[PDB]
Structure formats: C-alpha cells, structure tokens
C-alpha cells in the first residue's frame, strides 16, 4: 500500500520542520570561509 506515507508527508508538523532545516542549511553555506580551506 502507498497510503500510510501521504498523511506524514502532508502533515502540518512535517511542513514546518523541513522549512527550517533548509534555512539552517543555507545559513551554514553562507558561513563558509572562502580563503582558509584547511581551517
């Protein structure tokens, strides 16, 4: 069956946790040091 995953996908809780993981990922990307590669 392929019904037990749709509720988890479209749940209100699961649409506001990944939206902050992506913000943290972008922030971590923005904090990279361009000069010091081995730092």
From Swiss-Prot:
Oligomer status and interactors: Voltage-dependent calcium channels are multisubunit complexes, consisting of alpha-1, alpha-2, beta and delta subunits in a 1:1:1:1 ratio. The channel activity is directed by the pore-forming and voltage-sensitive alpha-1 subunit. In many cases, this subunit is sufficient to generate voltage-sensitive calcium channel activity. The auxiliary subunits beta and alpha-2/delta linked by a disulfide bridge regulate the channel activity. Channel activity is further modulated, depending on the presence of specific delta subunit isoforms.
Q: Which domain of life is it from?
A: Eukaryota
Domains as described in the record: Each of the four internal repeats contains five hydrophobic transmembrane segments (S1, S2, S3, S5, S6) and one positively charged transmembrane segment (S4). S4 segments probably represent the voltage-sensor and are characterized by a series of positively charged amino acids at every third position.
UniProt family annotation:
Belongs to the calcium channel alpha-1 subunit (TC 1.A.1.11) family. CACNA1D subfamily.
Output this protein's name.
Answer: Voltage-dependent L-type calcium channel subunit alpha-1D
Outline what the protein does: Voltage-sensitive calcium channels (VSCC) mediate the entry of calcium ions into excitable cells and are also involved in a variety of calcium-dependent processes, including muscle contraction, hormone or neurotransmitter release, gene expression, cell motility, cell division and cell death. The isoform alpha-1D gives rise to L-type calcium currents. Long-lasting (L-type) calcium channels belong to the 'high-voltage activated' (HVA) group. They are blocked by dihydropyridines (DHP), phenylalkylamines, and by benzothiazepines.
Q: Which disease is it linked to?
A: Sinoatrial node dysfunction and deafness: A disease characterized by congenital severe to profound deafness without vestibular dysfunction, associated with episodic syncope due to intermittent pronounced bradycardia. Primary aldosteronism, seizures, and neurologic abnormalities: A disorder characterized by hypertension, hypokalemia, and high aldosterone levels with low plasma renin activity and an elevated aldosterone/renin ratio. Other features include generalized seizures, cerebral palsy, spasticity, intellectual disability, and developmental delay.
Q: In which tissues is it expressed?
A: Expressed in pancreatic islets and in brain, where it has been seen in cerebral cortex, hippocampus, basal ganglia, habenula and thalamus. Expressed in the small cell lung carcinoma cell line SCC-9. No expression in skeletal muscle.
According to the record, the segments passing through the membrane are 13-31
Tell me where it resides.
Membrane
